[PDB]
Amino acid sequence: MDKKSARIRRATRARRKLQELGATRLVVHRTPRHIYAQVIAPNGSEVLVAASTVEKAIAEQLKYTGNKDAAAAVGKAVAERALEKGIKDVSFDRSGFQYHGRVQALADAAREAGLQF
Amino acid sequence: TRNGRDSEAKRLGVKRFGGESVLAGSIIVRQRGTKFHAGANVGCGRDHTLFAKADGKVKFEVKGPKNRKFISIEAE
Amino acid sequence: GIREKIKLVSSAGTGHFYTTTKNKRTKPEKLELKKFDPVVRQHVIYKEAKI
Amino acid sequence: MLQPKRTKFRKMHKGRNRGLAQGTDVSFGSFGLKAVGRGRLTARQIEAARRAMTRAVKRQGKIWIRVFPDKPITEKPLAVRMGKGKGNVEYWVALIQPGKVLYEMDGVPEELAREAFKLAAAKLPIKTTFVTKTVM
Amino acid sequence: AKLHDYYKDEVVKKLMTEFNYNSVMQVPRVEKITLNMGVGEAIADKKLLDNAAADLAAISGQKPLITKARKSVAGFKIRQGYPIGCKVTLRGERMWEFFERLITIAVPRIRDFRGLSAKSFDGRGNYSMGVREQIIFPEIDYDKVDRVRGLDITITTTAKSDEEGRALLAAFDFPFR
RNA sequence: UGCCUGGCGGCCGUAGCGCGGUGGUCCCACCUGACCCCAUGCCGAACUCAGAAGUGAAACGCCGUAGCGCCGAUGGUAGUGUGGGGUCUCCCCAUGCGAGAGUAGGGAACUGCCAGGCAU
RNA sequence: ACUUACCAACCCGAUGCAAACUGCGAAUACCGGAGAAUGUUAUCACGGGAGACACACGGCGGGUGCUAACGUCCGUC
RNA sequence: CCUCCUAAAGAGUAACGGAGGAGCACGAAGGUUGGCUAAUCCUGGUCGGACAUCAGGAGGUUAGUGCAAUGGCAUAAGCCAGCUUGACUGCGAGCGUGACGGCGCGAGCAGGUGCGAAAGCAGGUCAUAGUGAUCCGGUGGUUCUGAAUGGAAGGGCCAUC
Ligand SMILES: [Mg+2]
Ligand SMILES: [Mg+2]
Ligand SMILES: [Mg+2]
Ligand SMILES: [Mg+2]
Ligand SMILES: [Mg+2]
Ligand SMILES: [Mg+2]
Ligand SMILES: [Mg+2]
Ligand SMILES: [Mg+2]
Ligand SMILES: [Mg+2]
Ligand SMILES: [Mg+2]
Ligand SMILES: [Mg+2]
Ligand SMILES: [Mg+2]
Ligand SMILES: [Mg+2]
Ligand SMILES: [Mg+2]
Ligand SMILES: [Mg+2]
Ligand SMILES: [Mg+2]
Ligand SMILES: [Mg+2]
Ligand SMILES: [Mg+2]
Ligand SMILES: [Mg+2]
Ligand SMILES: [Mg+2]
Structure with a gap:
């Protein structure tokens, strides 16, 4: 399997379990250059909140968009935007990536900002 | 060698239909x-x-990319 | 068959025991597992004895 | 004498022989010998008929046998009561429905194929007809 | 490190003008170098596999992976999961350091060496060769070696054809016929 | 509002495969470096971290294209519930239901939420 | 190593066969919901009294037997 | 006793009908978290052959599943590693299957536990065989009983042989 299709396979079990539980998930996407976070409704077809390094307001205050510090910024941003809309309780979807480094930096910062998972 | 054997029928199948x-x-x-x-x-x-x-109605459907059979319960 | 019944006794002093089987040839060492003792209402260590 | 080289199972349920044949056209040769009746062709019957048509054409042209005796037939010998297991396989049959092209031929004139098929038909337990290849 | 610099500064340039590629990313790259020792006789004497693994570890500076029988075969009298060989996958710095050691000192020390074959390519650019004696490698001590053993060397490349793969190796002055 | 790209879904081949063409500002990809976080029953391949010199070659996306997959009538044929009948191993008639295969033909998906780049 | 009027799996095109084959797939039958008419409650529950557990032929769908038997064994009328 | 066909597209369905298998295994081959992906064929490669291990391509689950068969299985149920004992104790809405004795599936509740950052998952094993009622007797435990009374014997209850 190629990198993407191996990662999507690694992501499928947790996503089906969250779909079964009807959980609001905090979906993370990582790229060598950028990190993205989306709060998606239990239906899976609508994004309640979002934050990423492709956004000029977030990238301007960062050294490099694809590092752990940038990940912590995206995490703090999604959680703040989510709490402003009343979204508190979520479930983290690592999306086939390891719960480590940049992914873990985003999660730790989102939990710190007030998001419950 | 010799035949003559079978096992008890397990009574499988659908118990409650759509x-x-x-x-x-x-x-x-x-x-x-x-x-x-x-x-x-x-x-x-x-x-x-x-x-x-949950209490509700039996619903059979075909879902996903593999066209799999799924049984769910719809609230009445 | 070639597998014997053994009793796992509670270390908590209560006469409580779990019951299981063992291949005594391949595994000659006494089986030790942490199991729930319903007399002390806690998970304590259980050590093999003869049935 | 035709027979499956190996089978998944030795014995077969009697079954039935309802319906019309699949493989009703002359598919390989120019002429064909077609079943008009319903029945069972044994491997010995098929071999007897194959021999008759082959002698007739002086082993010239080409012959195709569209039927295969893949059905095992069991029999209980004399002085054996009912039950005590299914009988032993004695011979093989092809199930025949009205319309099966049994044999085909080419590389010979029509008159010779008609005669060779007339001789072969006299060995068979079921009524047959002479057929020719068609455009669709 | 030396031969990777040689690839960048001189090999890339040579292949670009040879095949007229539109992009530098089309230029064949030496992906990995795989060394293998098919022990086989390890089934009778278990110690023979350990000595083969220690030989491969000296030749290439990394811990060998002992390869087990994928399936059982009555012909060679081996059951599945039996240690029947050892391999090393070389990439980056270790692969290049090995590639130079192979061309510069190991391959010239072959008994009556006249040149390696240029036709032993898999049809897709990858090159495969075998060494009969492991003592050609100066990392192995003639006085300490228990037995004379051989090994397989496969150079996996990004070349689409044999003609492309040949030009990549020849550009490193790989001793061909 | 339009074009392009990323993420997450709906739908589950009319949606896939192949062949041809095409894209890098952005995004994506490969890519650079690796002591370290972290990783390899060996290997920085993968997982991972720090990045931006290079390239769209591969991959991926998009556009085209019926070689294949896939969808697919109408009509006929096969079967069959009920009632009747024959030359009753099998059929036929009245009535209702009516395939499978094949044929004409269709077909190079459609669609929602959010974000980014560009243009008016 | 070279070669042959022989045999030849796989693969491609064409042709059939299968109770223990299925990339298809009915009629019926069966489960469930709602509604009328009809039916001396035909239904369910509990309680008093049983009898019966050798079946036969005919139709249809089958196993067995020889698509033999006024044969034999199931299903259903 | 288990699997398939006969069995007529719900269940069930007979014959000295047609085919096979069980009377065990496993402290990991159980739990969880994280990861991984076959068979077969073509080409190249020391010893090395039709077949061992290595590399690439085709292929796409035809492999694998402790074992018969059938249904499943990629989110794998298949393969590996780290940590582990949920192979937990008390219960159980509601069902399935039985003439019955019984046998089965079960979310959820309480206590305590493992794994995971978390959502969560775990009351053995992909599922369906791997079994023996009652009586009598043995062992351990026990706010029960204890033939005048206090004990004890014996009996009960719970666990087990
Ligand atoms: Mg990289
Ligand atoms: Mg390209
Ligand atoms: Mg119609
Ligand atoms: Mg239809
Ligand atoms: Mg049709
Ligand atoms: Mg079709
Ligand atoms: Mg068209
Ligand atoms: Mg926008
Ligand atoms: Mg009554
Ligand atoms: Mg009786
Ligand atoms: Mg009787
Ligand atoms: Mg009767
Ligand atoms: Mg009778
Ligand atoms: Mg049935
Ligand atoms: Mg039925
Ligand atoms: Mg297992
Ligand atoms: Mg997992
Ligand atoms: Mg070979
Ligand atoms: Mg914890
Ligand atoms: Mg007293």
Whole structure:
């Protein structure tokens, strides 16, 4: 399997379990250059909140968009935007990536900002 | 060598069909493998038995990229 | 068959025991597992004895 | 004598022989010998008929046998009561329905194929007809 | 490190003008170098596999992976999961350091060496060769070696054809016929 | 509002495969470096971290294209519930239901939420 | 190593066969919901009294037997 | 006793009908978290052959599943590693299957536990064989009983042989 299709396979079990539980998930996407976070409704077809390094307001205050510090910024941003809309309780979807480094930096910062998972 | 043997029939199959109103816990299908998969408000037992997790109506559907059979329970 | 019944006794002093089987040839060492003792209402260590 | 080289199972349920044949056209040769009746062709019957048509054409042209005796037939010998297991396989049959092209031929004139098929038909337990290849 | 610099500064340039590629990313790259020792006789004497693994570890500076029988075969009298060989996958710095050691000192020390074959390519650019004696490698001590053993060397490349793969190796002055 | 790209779904081949063409500002990809976080029953391949010199080659996306997959009538044929009948191993008639295969033909998906780049 | 009027799996095109084959797939039958008419409650529950557990032929769908038997074994009328 | 066909597309369905298998295994081959992906064929490669291990391509689950068969299985149920004992104790809405004795599936509740950052998952094993009622007797435990009374014997209850 190629990198993407191996990662999507690694992501499928947790996503089906969250779909079964009807959980609001905090979906993370990582790229060598950028990190993205989306709060998606239990239906899976609508994004309640979002934050990423492709956004000029977030990238301007960062050294490099694809590092752990940038990940912590995206995490703090999604959680703040989510709490402003009343979204508190979520479930983290690592999306086939390891719960480590940049992914873990985003999660730790989102939990710190007030998001419950 | 010699024949003459068989085992007891296991009484498998559908217990409750589409539209049937069931109470939570009710066995919907006794099967050997997952011919049918557990959908919303339906659980899968250790012998692949599908049962109601909520009170409601039995709903059979074909879902996903593999065109798999799923049994769910719709609230009435 | 070639597998014997053994009793796992509670270390908590209560006479409580779990019951299981063992291949005594391949595994001659006494089986030790942490199991729930319903007399002390806690998980304590259980050590093999003869049935 | 035709027979499956190996089978998944030795014995077969009697079954029935309802319906019309599949393989009703002359598919390989120019002429064909077609079943008009319903029945069973044994491997010995098929071999007897194959021999008759082959002698007739002085082993010239080409012959195709569209039928295969893949059905095992069991029999209980004399002085054996009912039950005590299914009998032993004695011979093989092809199930025949009205319309099966049994044999085909080419590389010979029509008059010779008609005669060779007339001789072969006299060995068979079921009524047959002479057929020719068609455009669709 | 030396031969990777040689690839960048001189090999890339040579292949670009040879095949007229539109992009530098089309230029064949030496992906990995795989060394293998098919022990086989390890089934009778278990110690023979350990000595083969220690030989491969000296030749290439990394811990060898002992390869087990994928399936059982009555012909060679081996059951599945039996340690029947050892391999090393070389990439980056270790692969290049090995590639130079192979061309510069190991391959010239072959008994009556006249040149390696240029036709032993898999049809897709990858090159495969075998060494009969492991003592050609100066990392192995003639006085300490228990037995004379051989090994397989496969150079996996990004070349689409044999003609492309040949030009990549020849550009490193790989001793061909 | 339009074009393009990323993420997450709906739908589950009319949606896939192949062949041809095409894209890098952005995004994506490969890519650079690796002591370290972290990783390899060996290997920085993968997982991972720090990055931006290079390239769209591969991959991926997009556009085209019926070689294949796939969808697919109408009509006929096969079966069959009920009632009747024959030359009753099998059929036929009245009535209702009516395939499978094949044929004409269709077909190079459609669609929602959010974000980014560009243009008016 | 070279070669042959022989045999030849796989693969491609064409042709059939299968109770223990299925990339298809009915009629019926069966489960469930609602509604009328009809039916001396025909239904369910509990309680008093049983009898019966050798079936036969005919139709249809089959196993067995020889698509033999006024044969034999199931299903259903 | 288990699997398939006969069995007529719900269940069930007979014959000295047609085919096979069980009377065990496993402290990991159980739990969980994280990861991984076959068979077969073509080409190249020391010893090395039709077949061992290595590399690439085709292929796409035809492999694998402790074992018969059938149904499942990629989110794998298949393969590996780290940590582990949920192979937990008390219960149980509601069902399935039985003439019955019984046998089965079960979310959820309480206590305590393992794994995971978390959502969660775990009351053995992909599922369906792997079994023996009652009586009598043995062992351990026990707010029960204890033939005048206090004990004890014996009996009960719970666990087990
Ligand atoms: Mg990289
Ligand atoms: Mg390209
Ligand atoms: Mg119609
Ligand atoms: Mg239809
Ligand atoms: Mg049709
Ligand atoms: Mg079709
Ligand atoms: Mg067209
Ligand atoms: Mg926008
Ligand atoms: Mg009564
Ligand atoms: Mg009786
Ligand atoms: Mg009787
Ligand atoms: Mg009767
Ligand atoms: Mg009679
Ligand atoms: Mg049935
Ligand atoms: Mg039926
Ligand atoms: Mg297992
Ligand atoms: Mg997992
Ligand atoms: Mg070879
Ligand atoms: Mg914890
Ligand atoms: Mg007293």
